[PDB]
Amino acid sequence: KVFGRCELAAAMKRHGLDNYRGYSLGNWVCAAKFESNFNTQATNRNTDGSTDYGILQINSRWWCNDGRTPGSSNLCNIPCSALLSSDITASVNCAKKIVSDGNGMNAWVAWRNRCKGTDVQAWIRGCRA
Fold first, then answer.
1. Which of 7, 35, 48, 66 is catalytic?
2. 119 is catalytic
3. What domain count does the chain have?
4. Angle of CA points 9, 77, 101, to nearest 5°
5. Could you say which of 18, 48, 52, 119 is catalytic?
6. CA gap 125, 128 in Å, rounded
7. For residue 53, what are the domain limits?
8. Considering only CA atoms, which of 36, 48, 54, 35 is closest in space to residue 109?
9. How far apart are CA 48 and CA 38, in angstroms?
């Protein structure tokens, strides 16, 4: 599924991301835009052999099991394929574990490079609300 900007903001809010660990909703919407262009089916393979999955590009080195990343953990206790669902529950639950790991949203490279320090409230502007 390809979310609309406000549709995703609403789904994230419902799932408890607004101000989670102090990150306002616009941060999460900005991170999803630049990691996946709001597409739940996005995948990208990394040079180390791990793959990133879903709307928040969650990595198989640490967080999910895809059966093809030998050095790896599955800290979210889920198949990586679950992160590709039209239902973002699995992604959000895993993202909450990631953001609590010590580096905050810096875990997401696109957030650090494209959202951090910018006017992120613009991402929820106009949404109901």
1. 35
2. no
3. 1
4. 65
5. 52
6. 9
7. 1-129
8. 35
9. 25
